[PDB]
Amino acid sequence: GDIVSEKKPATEVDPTHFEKRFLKRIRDLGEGHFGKVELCRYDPEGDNTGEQVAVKSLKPHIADLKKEIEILRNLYHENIVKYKGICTEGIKLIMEFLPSGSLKEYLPKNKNKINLKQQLKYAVQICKGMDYLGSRQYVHRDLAARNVLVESEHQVKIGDFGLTKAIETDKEYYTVKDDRDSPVFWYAPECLMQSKFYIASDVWSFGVTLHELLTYCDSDSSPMALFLKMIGPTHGQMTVTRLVNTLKEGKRLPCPPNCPDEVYQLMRKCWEFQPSNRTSFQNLIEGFEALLK
């Protein structure tokens, strides 16, 4: 008799689903090698009132971004950037937008407001985020100031997980294959030499990130700048080897100006050449807390 259609089942609204047609690009926020993040307004009413979100997509790998999304989705911590959702057909990760941006952007513009005490609190907060990540059996592999987002003058959050990887149960490390675009000047020796990644490797990276925090992410003070000073800036493809050598010799980044030795000693506990000799995120927390009392 009559044209048979399907009975429409009552459609809910998934608050973690962002319709592409309503996601309006405002501007670029930053990139990785294969990923990029844009500021957008999710503006379903079309009057520029919608919330601002950070949208992560692939540069023209889908499986790695899906993995990153599964990681972020199930991380619940105040020092971890918030998952808001996804936008699907292909996929985009939707996160909270932090207007102060990363430490690289915020620190140089707010030096006057940010004293050693606030920096130690950030450092504490970065350790708590990382420790949490470590308890989820993840290694981050990209801990640097550019990935530490400023929520407020009193709060930072780890704001990217493009390189994050689970470590198998009953295993101490993750062996990486693709290492082309490694942040070598943030990387522990075991990473630079054997492509192995421990939680301890992230402790090393934190030391370098802490050093960035302490130099207010000044570009002329970056671990890359300073390292290319110690080893030479014109070794091309021998750079990494020259790096591993220097580190073998016991050379590390120098103490930041106006950084008390006691803070610098916690930093150097991070840069123990052997992973088993490095401090842990919880000991760093205890250390920093000690300095704040």
Ligand SMILES: C[C@@H](O)c1nc2cnc3[nH]ccc3c2n1[C@H]1CC[C@H](CC#N)CC1
């Ligand atoms: C300015 C830039 O550092 C920045 N501002 C942000 C505000 N909210 C955000 N939410 C998620 C990222 C993010 C933000 N990012 C960058 C953080 C690192 C990221 C690295 C990659 N890909 C690129 C965006």
